[PDB]
Design an enzyme around this catalytic site. Sequence first.
Site, PDB file in Angstrom:
ATOM      1  N   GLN A  86       0.822  -1.211   0.000  1.00 24.65           N
ATOM      2  CA  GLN A  86       0.000   0.000   0.000  1.00 24.65           C
ATOM      3  C   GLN A  86       0.865   1.274   0.000  1.00 24.65           C
ATOM      4  O   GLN A  86       0.379   2.368  -0.327  1.00 24.65           O
ATOM      5  CB  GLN A  86      -0.947   0.044   1.210  1.00 24.65           C
ATOM      6  CG  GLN A  86      -1.925  -1.094   1.257  1.00 24.65           C
ATOM      7  CD  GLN A  86      -2.917  -1.074   2.418  1.00 24.65           C
ATOM      8  OE1 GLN A  86      -3.275  -2.131   2.923  1.00 24.65           O
ATOM      9  NE2 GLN A  86      -3.386   0.133   2.808  1.00 24.65           N
ATOM     10  N   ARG A 137      -9.908  -0.590   7.835  1.00 25.58           N
ATOM     11  CA  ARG A 137     -10.645   0.676   7.774  1.00 25.58           C
ATOM     12  C   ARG A 137     -10.778   1.367   9.115  1.00 25.58           C
ATOM     13  O   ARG A 137     -11.753   2.038   9.403  1.00 25.58           O
ATOM     14  CB  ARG A 137     -11.989   0.520   7.127  1.00 25.58           C
ATOM     15  CG  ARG A 137     -11.950   0.069   5.670  1.00 25.58           C
ATOM     16  CD  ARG A 137     -13.251   0.250   4.912  1.00 25.58           C
ATOM     17  NE  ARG A 137     -13.319  -0.646   3.750  1.00 25.58           N
ATOM     18  CZ  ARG A 137     -14.131  -0.493   2.722  1.00 25.58           C
ATOM     19  NH1 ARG A 137     -14.638   0.700   2.374  1.00 25.58           N
ATOM     20  NH2 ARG A 137     -14.389  -1.542   1.969  1.00 25.58           N
ATOM     21  N   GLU A 191     -12.990   4.918   4.535  1.00 18.22           N
ATOM     22  CA  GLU A 191     -13.146   4.203   5.796  1.00 18.22           C
ATOM     23  C   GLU A 191     -14.405   4.557   6.571  1.00 18.22           C
ATOM     24  O   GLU A 191     -14.800   3.801   7.463  1.00 18.22           O
ATOM     25  CB  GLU A 191     -11.900   4.400   6.680  1.00 18.22           C
ATOM     26  CG  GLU A 191     -10.665   3.822   6.043  1.00 18.22           C
ATOM     27  CD  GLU A 191      -9.439   4.235   6.782  1.00 18.22           C
ATOM     28  OE1 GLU A 191      -9.163   5.464   6.787  1.00 18.22           O
ATOM     29  OE2 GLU A 191      -8.802   3.378   7.428  1.00 18.22           O
TER      30      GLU A 191
HETATM   31  N1  LIG Z   1     -14.624  13.372  -1.730  1.00 15.46           N
HETATM   32  C1  LIG Z   1     -14.382  12.202  -2.289  1.00 15.46           C
HETATM   33  C2  LIG Z   1     -13.711  11.156  -1.565  1.00 15.46           C
HETATM   34  C3  LIG Z   1     -13.359   9.986  -2.267  1.00 15.46           C
HETATM   35  N2  LIG Z   1     -13.777   9.866  -3.544  1.00 15.46           N
HETATM   36  C4  LIG Z   1     -13.287   8.747  -4.297  1.00 15.46           C
HETATM   37  O1  LIG Z   1     -13.344   7.560  -3.503  1.00 15.46           O
HETATM   38  C5  LIG Z   1     -12.091   6.775  -3.581  1.00 15.46           C
HETATM   39  C6  LIG Z   1     -11.546   6.608  -2.232  1.00 15.46           C
HETATM   40  O2  LIG Z   1     -10.871   7.826  -1.890  1.00 15.46           O
HETATM   41  P1  LIG Z   1     -10.409   8.118  -0.378  1.00 15.46           P
HETATM   42  O3  LIG Z   1     -11.597   8.218   0.505  1.00 15.46           O
HETATM   43  O4  LIG Z   1      -9.450   9.258  -0.498  1.00 15.46           O
HETATM   44  O5  LIG Z   1      -9.681   6.766   0.118  1.00 15.46           O
HETATM   45  P2  LIG Z   1      -8.313   6.096  -0.383  1.00 15.46           P
HETATM   46  O6  LIG Z   1      -8.324   6.086  -1.863  1.00 15.46           O
HETATM   47  O7  LIG Z   1      -7.175   6.725   0.330  1.00 15.46           O
HETATM   48  O8  LIG Z   1      -8.561   4.608   0.107  1.00 15.46           O
HETATM   49  C7  LIG Z   1      -8.111   4.075   1.380  1.00 15.46           C
HETATM   50  C8  LIG Z   1      -9.248   3.377   2.013  1.00 15.46           C
HETATM   51  O9  LIG Z   1      -9.933   2.572   1.139  1.00 15.46           O
HETATM   52  C9  LIG Z   1     -10.834   1.677   1.743  1.00 15.46           C
HETATM   53  N3  LIG Z   1     -11.591   1.059   0.686  1.00 15.46           N
HETATM   54  C10 LIG Z   1     -11.031   0.004  -0.027  1.00 15.46           C
HETATM   55  N4  LIG Z   1     -11.686  -0.363  -1.159  1.00 15.46           N
HETATM   56  C11 LIG Z   1     -11.124  -1.320  -1.934  1.00 15.46           C
HETATM   57  N5  LIG Z   1     -11.733  -1.724  -3.033  1.00 15.46           N
HETATM   58  N6  LIG Z   1      -9.925  -1.874  -1.572  1.00 15.46           N
HETATM   59  C12 LIG Z   1      -9.317  -1.598  -0.419  1.00 15.46           C
HETATM   60  O10 LIG Z   1      -8.142  -2.124  -0.127  1.00 15.46           O
HETATM   61  C13 LIG Z   1      -9.826  -0.581   0.404  1.00 15.46           C
HETATM   62  N7  LIG Z   1      -9.252  -0.284   1.656  1.00 15.46           N
HETATM   63  C14 LIG Z   1     -10.079   0.649   2.481  1.00 15.46           C
HETATM   64  C15 LIG Z   1      -9.083   1.339   3.505  1.00 15.46           C
HETATM   65  S1  LIG Z   1      -8.472   0.405   4.819  1.00 15.46           S
HETATM   66  C16 LIG Z   1      -8.733   2.598   3.255  1.00 15.46           C
HETATM   67  S2  LIG Z   1      -7.574   3.376   4.294  1.00 15.46           S
HETATM   68  C17 LIG Z   1     -11.246   7.509  -4.630  1.00 15.46           C
HETATM   69  O11 LIG Z   1     -11.382   7.038  -5.978  1.00 15.46           O
HETATM   70  C18 LIG Z   1     -11.802   8.908  -4.615  1.00 15.46           C
HETATM   71  O12 LIG Z   1     -11.539   9.709  -5.733  1.00 15.46           O
HETATM   72  C19 LIG Z   1     -14.557  10.768  -4.168  1.00 15.46           C
HETATM   73  O13 LIG Z   1     -15.101  10.529  -5.314  1.00 15.46           O
HETATM   74  N8  LIG Z   1     -14.861  12.016  -3.524  1.00 15.46           N
END
Ligand SMILES: Nc1ccn([C@@H]2O[C@H](COP(=O)(O)OP(=O)(O)OC[C@H]3Oc4nc5nc(N)nc(O)c5nc4C(S)=C3S)[C@@H](O)[C@H]2O)c(=O)n1
EC number: 1.2.5.3
Lengths: 287, 286, 161, 158, 795, 152
Positions: free
Chosen positions: E226, E373, E749
Amino acid sequence: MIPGSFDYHRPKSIADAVALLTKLGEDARPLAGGHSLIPIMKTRLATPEHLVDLRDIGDLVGIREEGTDVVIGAMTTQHALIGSDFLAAKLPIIRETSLLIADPQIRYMGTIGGNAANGDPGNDMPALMQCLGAAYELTGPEGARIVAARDYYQGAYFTAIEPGELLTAIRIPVPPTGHGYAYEKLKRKIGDYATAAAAVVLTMSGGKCVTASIGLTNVANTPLWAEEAGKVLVGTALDKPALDKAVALAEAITAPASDGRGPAEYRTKMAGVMLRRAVERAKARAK
Amino acid sequence: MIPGSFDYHRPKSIADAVALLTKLGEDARPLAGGHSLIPIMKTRLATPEHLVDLRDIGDLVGIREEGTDVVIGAMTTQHALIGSDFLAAKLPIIRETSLLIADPQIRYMGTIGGNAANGDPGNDMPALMQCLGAAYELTGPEGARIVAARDYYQGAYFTAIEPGELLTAIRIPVPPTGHGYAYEKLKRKIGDYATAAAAVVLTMSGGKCVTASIGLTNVANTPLWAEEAGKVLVGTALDKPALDKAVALAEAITAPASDGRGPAEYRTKMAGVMLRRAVERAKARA
Amino acid sequence: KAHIELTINGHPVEALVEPRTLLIHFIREQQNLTGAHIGCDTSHCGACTVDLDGMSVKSCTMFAVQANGASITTIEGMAAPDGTLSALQEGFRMMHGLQCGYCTPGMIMRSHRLLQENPSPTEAEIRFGIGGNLCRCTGYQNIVKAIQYAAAKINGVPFEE
Amino acid sequence: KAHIELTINGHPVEALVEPRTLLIHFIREQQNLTGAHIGCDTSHCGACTVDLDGMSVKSCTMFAVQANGASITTIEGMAAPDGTLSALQEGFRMMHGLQCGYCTPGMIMRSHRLLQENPSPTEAEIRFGIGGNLCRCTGYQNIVKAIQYAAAKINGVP
Amino acid sequence: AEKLQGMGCKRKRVEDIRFTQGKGNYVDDVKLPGMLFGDFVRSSHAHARIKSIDTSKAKALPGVFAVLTAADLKPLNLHYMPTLAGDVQAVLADEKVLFQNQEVAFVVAKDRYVAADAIELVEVDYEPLPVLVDPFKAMEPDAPLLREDIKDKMTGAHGARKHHNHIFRWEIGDKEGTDATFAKAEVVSKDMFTYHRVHPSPLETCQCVASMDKIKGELTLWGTFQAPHVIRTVVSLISGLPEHKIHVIAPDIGGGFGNKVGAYSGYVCAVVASIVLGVPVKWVEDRMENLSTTSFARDYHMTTELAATKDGKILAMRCHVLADHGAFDACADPSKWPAGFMNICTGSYDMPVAHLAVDGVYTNKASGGVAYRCSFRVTEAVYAIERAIETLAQRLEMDSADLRIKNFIQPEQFPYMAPLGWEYDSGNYPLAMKKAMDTVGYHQLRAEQKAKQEAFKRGETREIMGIGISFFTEIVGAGPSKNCDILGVSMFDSAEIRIHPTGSVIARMGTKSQGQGHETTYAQIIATELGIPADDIMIEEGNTDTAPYGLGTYGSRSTPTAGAATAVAARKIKAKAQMIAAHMLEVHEGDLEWDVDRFRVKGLPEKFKTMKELAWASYNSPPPNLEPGLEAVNYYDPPNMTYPFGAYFCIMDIDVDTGVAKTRRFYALDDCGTRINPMIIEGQVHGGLTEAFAVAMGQEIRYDEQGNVLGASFMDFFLPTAVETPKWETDYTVTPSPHHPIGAKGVGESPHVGGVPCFSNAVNDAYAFLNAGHIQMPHDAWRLWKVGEQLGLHV
Amino acid sequence: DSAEIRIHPTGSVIARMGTKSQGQGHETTYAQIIATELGIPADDIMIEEGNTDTAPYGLGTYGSRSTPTAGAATAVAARKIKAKAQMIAAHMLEVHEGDLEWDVDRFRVKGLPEKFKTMKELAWASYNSPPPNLEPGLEAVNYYDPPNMTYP
Ligand SMILES: Nc1ccn([C@@H]2O[C@H](COP(=O)(O)OP(=O)(O)OC[C@H]3Oc4nc5nc(N)nc(O)c5nc4C(S)=C3S)[C@@H](O)[C@H]2O)c(=O)n1
Ligand SMILES: Cc1cc2nc3c(=O)[nH]c(=O)nc-3n(C[C@H](O)[C@H](O)[C@H](O)COP(=O)(O)OP(=O)(O)OC[C@H]3O[C@@H](n4cnc5c(N)ncnc54)[C@H](O)[C@@H]3O)c2cc1C
Ligand SMILES: Cc1cc2nc3c(=O)[nH]c(=O)nc-3n(C[C@H](O)[C@H](O)[C@H](O)COP(=O)(O)OP(=O)(O)OC[C@H]3O[C@@H](n4cnc5c(N)ncnc54)[C@H](O)[C@@H]3O)c2cc1C
Ligand code: FES
Ligand code: FES
Ligand code: FES
Ligand code: FES
């Protein structure tokens, strides 16, 4: 770069090779060192259906003293010729000529019999063998025979060999102790066939030439034995006037190609220069 | 994940498979659907030297009615059981049970004979077969013989089969037309072996139970046939008092494992609840 | 196809090959020993040079079937097992005897045999002794130095400057 | 080793295998068809599902020698020969039925068989029908949409 | 218009093309010439000295190339590896084993079949030691000395070192003020809430392919990372190879869910083996090893108190946690935060004062904590507060919705300094709570519930109804350089964007997706900023040679950090494009205005240059003042975290006789500010709610008194299928982050953080009229049966 | 032509250029230019060319142009990094940038040579403790439009 397909054979004896070449006809070629045949297969100028590799026939490699000759097996490599102390003693012109053939890799593979049999006027051994008055021992389905090197070459890629035959050995009369010799080659770079080259063997006594023989390489569609040029040196002191006569008689039997090495007239003249230079070096060596 | 090495055989006939099993002895195991055996080979809890695959033996697959029985070849898959509309007309409890076993992939491969023969108290078919009073047909080097399902199970992976025998078919008496039936299973999720399950078949006349038979799944080291519990239902209106009695008699014979599904006391009570619910659904059907 | 058994870089090899497969292609395409290179179609350049039964051979001018029973060394076979480069490999780096690197496998494999033929060669002997190998980048001067370096390393004493 | 001959994605395959080689490893390691995945060691997840002689099979719970003579489809086999995605492949994308992609080959291979078993399934039938396939990312809701989308496309074709 | 697919669009995912066709590239798909396979001999014991390891039979086995033990690692100083928590973890066990299934030797073989054979040949001689599994006993005077490598015996709390099983004590907040409030408050509400050990269980396990090229002196390492740049830097620091010669590649990853942040023994052993052998070495773990030997989640025992007036004003919170870390503290976190952001546990409520203390202890179990998460222990923080609200409300005889409403931080109070030190960025809690309550018909549910309870008491039903509420404040986007670092690297992230002459784009970021859709969504940010269609943009992550340095994907930080960097880098390009436009149009930059995909001259809107034209001009006719080309980089140091929030409501029906609970309805309102891709967010929520369901209703990893790990396979570990998983109803409000370049907060999360308390609150609420007290998770059927059994419901 | 230079936290470097060697030694010589500019040994620098996904856009190698164009860009991009490094040093040493002097591989305080930061230390600091007005990290790009040819 890529040859056409073929079947591959490894006969165990001369007899078996000859039986194969006879059975299979023109579609089969002997494979010796492969350093003329494989290149032309790769351009598809030659597309044999069968290659008869002579490598497992131990009888075809060797340098032997027999009678008043040296007999060299057709599969003896250029490298082995150069490395022979015995040849260096009795027929030093062979080493000298071989070291002017091709390059180290090619000399590890290429054979004296392949050089003699190939029929390319660019090969250096043919005219050396004519100079030395060598005989070629052939074996075929009808038995053994001998053809003088002086009679073996009729045209480019046109030799006295018959269907089914292999050149098995070259028999060379050992020249007198103390003879002079030289092979003088003009070429564009290492590995190139001669613009012109001359082989000379001669003997001297008391200031005078007793014997002389001259071969000319790559200045006609065959090697040439410059019979009259050698004859006119006998009795002379091998000075500029004698050489002038020999040069004229040599030039007169040439008929060179015009190619990247130059026009035919140039190559004829170069045959004469190579002759002069070879005679001079052989004269010095004699005794 | 990785099994130990073995030699693999594909006999062409029952006779050839029994000959192989007899010759190779303890170090050879029949291979049917593979969906219990292969998982325990992959853990190396099983390390057989030979597998004898029954796949090419056509006589081991099929569903027929012969006299007052249905006879099912041992290699008949769960998927095939579910698909048989002929079985659903005669023994609809089988479809109901089979749909509660494993998942679609496993049901394509797993066999009724494997489920019966395996010996894991988690398997669903054993207690169903005890409820239905099925007989297992065994063939070995000494010939054919029959063992009641009720007599087949001695402990976890300890059964009445002998060396060199195959279970070749299951012979099931056909209940009357209009019988009630139910298989009621409590589990943690799809695919899980039961916390407890009950198989019930019963018949009614004039508002009274005339016959009843109960099996209990995975609430002891074997399936159980709850003989007394079924008898106490007979002659009753299948009302509260009668069910309370059957529940008591059924709970009394349990001896469950304490595992991720919960402690033994819970699973005993769940055998009761499953039994109540199964009788109710059977009653409605009847 | 023909069945062949040989030794390459000290390891046994068993293969099936068409008779017309050139040795260079068997080595590169089948054995995945891609150090040897093809620089020409007429047998001049030497980029395909391997050491074969004690000879420097242009592997583009031999069929793989001809190498049945042979022992071949390719450039991959030159370094020691302990990581350390051969004298020649080291001398080519120290003396800046390569640029593009395309002739280098064939140059080193030729030179390996040269120094067995003649452990203490003169400059003229070196130049002549690599006459079958073309380089486009270096102008040969630093290649000669590289071979002199390697010789002096092998011999424990320098010869020419 | 045993000599086997079978068909995978319409192509003949022949191989020499140890009897203990699991079919999922034969597919991934010897055949280099790495679409199928391994998610567990107890036969629960379904990530290794292939279509084999008309059945959905967990290929981690079968030996390659048992597949002798079989016809197997893996995810690589699902697209048309002109490259066009199957209805299921398209549905999974349109409905956001995947995230990390790891269950997806097995989910699509199971679903291919589900829609042959029942071309017009209800949601309860879909959920039960994929009960042998685990997904960590999607919470299944969009997978059900994907299957429904695919059924509608398929049911439009004729 | 149709092609842009920028911000706000439900853009379909570019990843799906390859993944639906089996043309993803996951680690186990990698095949390299000569590649071997390695795997571990593992401990059968939870706590024992290792007397001897006999490897001779395994080495002798045909196809075995090496069998490493700690004796081979020591001399490289690699028999321990550093952790993110600042401890060390054993790579191969040296003198002793400390958890069941710990790595003892590493066998390297032709393939995984031969490796498995050879593992069974290795013989380990053990000498049992007393096992410690109860963290409540870990600091008793006779507790076993586990960590002999770092600790001496220290049996009490008042010595010059902490107890030998005590890892850390961390405290924050105003102790004196909090104690004074609790001393005088009218109501004090106390409970001990256990958040039980669970596991992230990604469908793809942890694995790598190490390839040391001995000829070049360069290491390539494919793996399930990661945070691939962090792993490079760590590998450098421990191996001695320089970073420019370590090529880490995180390819497609089959889920991470926090399991793939840290390093594991298999990565180190593959590397060492490849270095020794000079050929590639693959390591792929099986499920049972993943569940029992990689990062667990949770395992906090939270003594949680609220002080209040009788009318329901919350005056203070006091919380002390006992954290069970297993045998080595491998808990991922920023380095200064040993209990993560547990100090967000005052939640959504305006309280004057609070105090938190956390003690970490060692036990004979696998390491971890932060995973699944958690947002760095925010799962635990939110559970503590949202459960405490409910138990307080019970004690006050108040409706818990009304208790929340009385105490919410109000929108005008943001940015809000909370009493344990975090400053919340923005939030409109009363509006979201109202929207939620209205949607689910809250007051009507409570009347329905009351009628159902009366029916239960009359013998008319065996089902009870619970209403779960979870109103939560998340904290994501770690984080400002002042206080957030991973092993000394500040927690920024990054983006690099390069526009080609013909107007397409390659962009890379310092994060790493494991399915969250980055390859789709980062392009949407750039598309809106520059007017370039999303399909004309290629996004890449995970190759440390090529991607700008970042800190990886965890803590829902991708959108806060790299998403910000993406916007800021795009805006650097835009500013340079404006200068190019000014040069081309012969005006002052200040005379130009941006209009979607072009700059126009103010007042002469006829005169304009498109971004596509400007990109070509940057190469074809670069203004003499400026460099050619059109590209930018940003490394974004966030000013604050982002604080998304949510309002979740669950209606749960429970059969008291079996214990079987069935979700009737689950409504999840999330507000993560500006929403980049509503389709992707919805998927993230579906997935996270399913996890929350699993954790609250069934999942566990347990240990028995002998230290055997229980339930660590899919035979027992509850992963729901499509049959068990509820339908999800999702909703939103939009409250942008004021400080973020596009107003976007993290979200991934949130569903798990908020969801677990929602489910648990529902179960607890169902039984509240029967005075069950706090029911500890998980709420599976046997456990809920025991609740009812103990309340006399069965007789 | 162009150069992009990125310094890792531990002080080694990846650098790419828009040219492409066919044997002229760029992988050796571009690192030499960087090493002198930055005081980072050449062996600690990796040079790459030829992958259009990764190398900055350039016009290639012909016209003996590599040294004139990308070699210039390499120096200019390295000077951008040095300038950022000098800012970081000044912040760490609590002096003005004009109080600093460069000594091969470090900035020293003028008249107080015992007070210094090496380039290695600065590279770590750029990731570990970025000065609050600067971005984290330490890298630069230059696209170099030459003012004339060179006339050897
Ligand atoms: N305001 C926002 C926030 C997010 N997004 C979209 O949602 C996605 C997730 O963004 P974000 O919330 O920034 O999270 P991360 O990409 O940093 O993902 C990490 C998070 O992701 C989670 N969801 C998961 N989902 C999948 N499929 N796989 C994992 O390993 C995952 N692990 C978990 C865990 S644990 C964590 S820490 C991105 O495509 C983003 O552009 C969005 O459209 N608008
Ligand atoms: C780059 C290069 C440069 C060269 N430079 C020169 C040079 O300067 N001077 C020179 O003389 N040569 C030169 N050669 C040619 C070289 O000497 C060949 O080795 C020679 O011409 C043929 O000998 P071989 O053993 O390789 O024959 P092969 O190539 O095997 O055979 C050549 C021909 O002779 C036939 N043949 C071979 N052996 C026999 C036999 N015993 N009986 C009957 N027929 C037979 C073959 O069937 C074929 O038709 C050069 C070659 C190369 C590739
Ligand atoms: C994920 C999962 C979930 C499952 N859930 C359930 C469930 O809910 N309920 C349930 O009932 N089952 C369940 N099963 C087990 C499944 O039904 C198996 O198919 C069954 O237990 C064995 O049948 P088989 O044909 O696969 O036999 P095999 O696995 O091939 O063999 C099992 C054993 O029986 C022996 N055997 C097989 N056939 C014969 C025969 N004809 N004669 C004598 N010996 C024979 C074998 O030698 C072996 O010892 C589950 C399995 C999996 C993998
Ligand atoms: S490729 Fe040129 S001599 Fe072989
Ligand atoms: S180094 Fe380029 S051809 Fe010799
Ligand atoms: S890999 Fe999980 S069922 Fe096959
Ligand atoms: S898409 Fe990730 S496991 Fe299903």
